[PDB]
Write a protein that binds this DNA or RNA. Structure first.
Ligand SMILES: [K+]
Ligand SMILES: [K+]
Ligand SMILES: [K+]
Ligand SMILES: [Mg+2]
Ligand SMILES: [Mg+2]
Ligand SMILES: [Mg+2]
Ligand SMILES: [Mg+2]
Ligand SMILES: [Mg+2]
Ligand SMILES: [Mg+2]
Ligand SMILES: [Mg+2]
Ligand SMILES: [Mg+2]
Ligand SMILES: [Mg+2]
Ligand SMILES: [Mg+2]
Ligand SMILES: [Mg+2]
Ligand SMILES: [Mg+2]
Ligand SMILES: [Mg+2]
Ligand SMILES: [Mg+2]
Ligand SMILES: [Mg+2]
Ligand SMILES: [Mg+2]
Ligand SMILES: [Mg+2]
Ligand SMILES: [Mg+2]
Ligand SMILES: [Mg+2]
Ligand SMILES: [Mg+2]
Ligand SMILES: [Mg+2]
Ligand SMILES: [Mg+2]
Ligand SMILES: [Mg+2]
Ligand SMILES: [Mg+2]
Ligand SMILES: [Mg+2]
Ligand SMILES: [Mg+2]
Ligand SMILES: [Mg+2]
Ligand SMILES: [Mg+2]
Ligand SMILES: [Mg+2]
Ligand SMILES: [Mg+2]
Ligand SMILES: [Mg+2]
Ligand SMILES: [Mg+2]
Ligand SMILES: [Mg+2]
Ligand SMILES: [Mg+2]
Ligand SMILES: [Mg+2]
Ligand SMILES: [Mg+2]
Ligand SMILES: [Mg+2]
Ligand SMILES: [Mg+2]
Ligand SMILES: [Mg+2]
Ligand SMILES: [Mg+2]
Ligand SMILES: [Mg+2]
Ligand SMILES: [Mg+2]
Ligand SMILES: [Mg+2]
Ligand SMILES: [Mg+2]
Ligand SMILES: [Mg+2]
Ligand SMILES: [Mg+2]
Ligand SMILES: [Mg+2]
Ligand SMILES: [Mg+2]
Ligand SMILES: [Mg+2]
Ligand SMILES: [Mg+2]
Ligand SMILES: [Mg+2]
Ligand SMILES: [Mg+2]
Ligand SMILES: [Mg+2]
Ligand SMILES: [Mg+2]
Ligand SMILES: [Mg+2]
Ligand SMILES: [Mg+2]
Ligand SMILES: [Mg+2]
Ligand SMILES: [Mg+2]
Ligand SMILES: [Mg+2]
Ligand SMILES: [Mg+2]
Ligand SMILES: [Mg+2]
Ligand SMILES: [Mg+2]
Ligand SMILES: [Mg+2]
Ligand SMILES: [Mg+2]
Ligand code: NA
Ligand code: NA
Ligand code: NA
Ligand code: NA
Ligand code: NA
Ligand SMILES: [Zn+2]
Lengths: 151, 81, 50
RNA sequence: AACGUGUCGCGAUGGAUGACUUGGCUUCCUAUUUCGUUGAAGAACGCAGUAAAGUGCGAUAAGUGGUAUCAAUUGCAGAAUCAUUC
RNA sequence: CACUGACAGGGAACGUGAGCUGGGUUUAGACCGUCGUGAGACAGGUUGGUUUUACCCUACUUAGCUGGAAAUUGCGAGAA
RNA sequence: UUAAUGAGAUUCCCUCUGUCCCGAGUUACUAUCUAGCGAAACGACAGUCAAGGGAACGGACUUGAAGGGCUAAGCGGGGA
RNA sequence: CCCAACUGCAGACCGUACUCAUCACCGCAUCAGGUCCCCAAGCAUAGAAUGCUCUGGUACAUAGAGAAAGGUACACUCAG
RNA sequence: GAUGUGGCCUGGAGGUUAGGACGAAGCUUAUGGCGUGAGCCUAAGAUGGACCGGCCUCUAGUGCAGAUCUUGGUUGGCGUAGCAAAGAUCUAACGGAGAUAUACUCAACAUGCAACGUUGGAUACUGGAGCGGGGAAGGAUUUCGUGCCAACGGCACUCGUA
RNA sequence: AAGUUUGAAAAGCACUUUGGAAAGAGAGUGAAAUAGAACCUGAAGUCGUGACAAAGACAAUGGAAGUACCUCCAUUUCAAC
């Protein structure tokens, strides 16, 4: 299940998604940046990433990606705007907000306390190379789990 | 040249389905089957391929009559009084 | 709403190519109700296909 | 600082291990035990209320008849009888 | 041959082919001479003959972020 | 020996030119940045040098000289 | 029984969808390769060259932003 | 290189002696103890769910780090190389969950982006040796309508030879 | 290539809520869903996360001795013992 449990179970809301069909590496950076944020400010950041006024910092899987000035706010130099991962993470936050509202909590006081992106089972395709070679064309989905606690 | 381009030069068929075995080994031009030697009376059978013999021998099909006659033999051709 | 079927039938009935077939941009929900050559022929007579 | 490193707790991916075994392999025995022009073996089509494969069967087609046996078959449905039998 | 003050000699895996080029050398085709019965041979001549891969680590060239004097710690205290 | 013929081998002349002196400017598509997608080769471990010895040409060993960490674009000296 | 013009009745079997290719076939694939036949418009022009156009067909082949170096081109120019 | 070891370990057999639903085998370990060692044993499982230990003897397909070893899986390279021949798309409306998607503040921009199908306009290409209309070979339902979008059409799809 | 080896029994997750859906959050069945349908056990390798340890550049690993801090470990001792 969830790799961690909330401090107060009755004051928390949890959301999950398995086999997302979003790039695990992109979703790893998109979801990790909101790990300690209030829910409302995490949702604002995703809206501004879609507007391309702020970026998602790429801290681990950033091998030879481009440099941008919008990564300075995160203390980095390299960042990106992974729109596919942002909309999926936006949907997950909406589910978590719905779980909190159904439990009688206030989403405006909800703080994300746990984010975990894990590599899911891969899907196999093939690509055709020179000299009659056939080579893998793997797809890498992800599992995303999170919960938020009342502040 | 030989290879990919010449693969598109291959037209027609050397073999079609055989009436006796249905294996797509009937040489259209030579009018004989590469798998069972039809229309020769006897079939193809070679000891250098025992594996091929076991694929086509008795018992690999239905044995519609052999099942009946084996029961009759095992019961000594029982008949009503 | 897709009018691919009606355009195909109208092109055959009128004996012309797709570029010469005009489907009324308005009144699209009654064009999509024509699933037969009989009904497309009524649209042509009514002036919804030209 | 940030990447990165190490340890521990918890997760994921991944299907080894153990237990299980209606399979295989090997040995031995018993017979009014050895196919076909009276059309075999093999090959092809088809057949169920529902049925792709497989199995069984051949336009009498998942079977007819006869002996036993005694209430089912079964995913659903259908089915005279609740059965000496028909 | 000519200019110049001068047209010194050398090394760097006979510097340097994932830098180039491919004229030579040294495959298979072919011609000549000589040799060999022959197939063939010749540091003899001749003509024709695919030059592959960097996105890794260093090196180098530029280009960003960034802590740190107990060179991350000690509170371990030294001023050109 | 030979007219004609030849994507055959060779030499010279006219013309012509960025082949060169000696390089410069411009275009399309790239590279480059982004969204989506997404491999391979290769991979003992790794990766700053000088000299020394050493299997006689070291990234590891000896003695010295360097070396704060992480990064983007290139590049072909080394990685025999 | 045989001719002429009628008339009456009967004319059995199999194939028939679709494709024929910058996506329907072969090349491991919707692969810039390969694959026989028929119909073939207007103008320029010698014209089945080449260029453009009515009919028919198509906007499908990852896109956006956008003057680094270095590239590739069925892209150019350059004083003496 | 030879030999020795009441020397260690594994699958089975003949004996013997034990254990297990109050938890067997297997598995996990900053669980310690013992042995020079091969290894043995205990502890814990917030592991498991049914078999199995010791000792004597017998037996064998009996011990792995490497064989450009075999099979399966994984992996750095790496969100990297790239996805650049065949000139090309623009616009409004309709459809669609695919939007004009927002704690406070806040008139709108500076906080839901990017992408689809159809129709009408626009622009362009093919240019009759055609991304035209029919056939053979080959293929065999790809044809047609409706529905549908998990996988597939190396981007995308509400579209499709799925 | 592939054991359909879930569970004793399908009792195979009604119903509520968010979502277009896939699914999530609850609630139920069951001794056990970390037994939820290619479902017993679930290793290694690799990866994520939280906590902690720190750490220049001596590639890392290693040996021997100490020390600092930790220790769900073991053993001993706790009255003139
Ligand atoms: K020679
Ligand atoms: K001893
Ligand atoms: K392997
Ligand atoms: Mg690059
Ligand atoms: Mg980059
Ligand atoms: Mg390719
Ligand atoms: Mg090929
Ligand atoms: Mg031929
Ligand atoms: Mg030819
Ligand atoms: Mg022939
Ligand atoms: Mg013939
Ligand atoms: Mg017969
Ligand atoms: Mg040299
Ligand atoms: Mg020398
Ligand atoms: Mg070279
Ligand atoms: Mg050279
Ligand atoms: Mg070189
Ligand atoms: Mg040469
Ligand atoms: Mg001679
Ligand atoms: Mg030569
Ligand atoms: Mg030669
Ligand atoms: Mg030549
Ligand atoms: Mg300090
Ligand atoms: Mg050196
Ligand atoms: Mg190099
Ligand atoms: Mg290069
Ligand atoms: Mg027809
Ligand atoms: Mg037809
Ligand atoms: Mg044609
Ligand atoms: Mg094909
Ligand atoms: Mg083939
Ligand atoms: Mg022409
Ligand atoms: Mg012409
Ligand atoms: Mg036109
Ligand atoms: Mg195409
Ligand atoms: Mg296009
Ligand atoms: Mg392409
Ligand atoms: Mg350029
Ligand atoms: Mg054995
Ligand atoms: Mg015992
Ligand atoms: Mg532990
Ligand atoms: Mg450990
Ligand atoms: Mg033992
Ligand atoms: Mg062995
Ligand atoms: Mg092993
Ligand atoms: Mg090997
Ligand atoms: Mg990876
Ligand atoms: Mg790239
Ligand atoms: Mg390319
Ligand atoms: Mg193109
Ligand atoms: Mg339009
Ligand atoms: Mg707005
Ligand atoms: Mg929008
Ligand atoms: Mg044109
Ligand atoms: Mg043209
Ligand atoms: Mg013409
Ligand atoms: Mg044509
Ligand atoms: Mg169709
Ligand atoms: Mg796609
Ligand atoms: Mg209960
Ligand atoms: Mg469990
Ligand atoms: Mg279980
Ligand atoms: Mg399991
Ligand atoms: Mg593991
Ligand atoms: Mg961990
Ligand atoms: Mg060292
Ligand atoms: Mg120590
Ligand atoms: Na010639
Ligand atoms: Na070396
Ligand atoms: Na040294
Ligand atoms: Na083609
Ligand atoms: Na591109
Ligand atoms: Zn045959």
């Amino acid at each position: 299940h969830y790799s961690r449990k909330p401090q107060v179970s009755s004051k928390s809301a949890k959301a999950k998604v398995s086999d997302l069909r979003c790039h695990y590496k992109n979703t790893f950076e998109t979801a990790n940046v909101i790990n300690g944020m209030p829910l409302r400010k995490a949702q604002q950041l995703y809206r501004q990433v879609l507007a391309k006024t702020r970026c998602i910092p790429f801290k681990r899987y950033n091998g030879k990606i481009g440099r941008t000035a919008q990564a300075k706010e995160w203390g980095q130099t390299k960042g990106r705007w992974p729109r596919k991962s942002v909309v999926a993470m936006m949907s997950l936050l909406k589910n978590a907000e719905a779980n909190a509202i159904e439990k009688g909590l206030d989403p405006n006081q909800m703080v994300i306390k746990h984010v975990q992106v894990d590599q899911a089972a891969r899907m196999r395709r093939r690509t055709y190379r020179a000299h009659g070679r056939i080579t893998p064309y793997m797809c890498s989905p992800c599992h995303v789990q999170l919960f938020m606690s009342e502040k | 040249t030989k290879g990919t381009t010449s693969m598109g030069q291959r037209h027609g068929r050397t073999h079609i389905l055989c009436r006796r075995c249905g294996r797509n080994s009937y040489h259209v031009q030579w009018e004989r089957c590469a798998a069972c030697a039809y229309p020769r009376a006897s079939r193809r059978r070679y000891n250098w391929s025992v594996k091929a013999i076991k694929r086509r021998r008795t018992g690999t099909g239905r044995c519609r009559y052999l099942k009946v006659v084996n029961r009759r033999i095992a019961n000594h051709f029982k008949t009503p009084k | 709403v897709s009018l691919k079927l009606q355009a195909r039938l109208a092109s055959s009935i009128l004996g012309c190519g797709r570029a010469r077939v005009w489907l009324d941009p308005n009144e699209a929900v009654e064009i999509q109700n024509a699933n037969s050559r009989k009904s497309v022929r009524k649209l042509i007579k009514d002036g919804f296909i030209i």
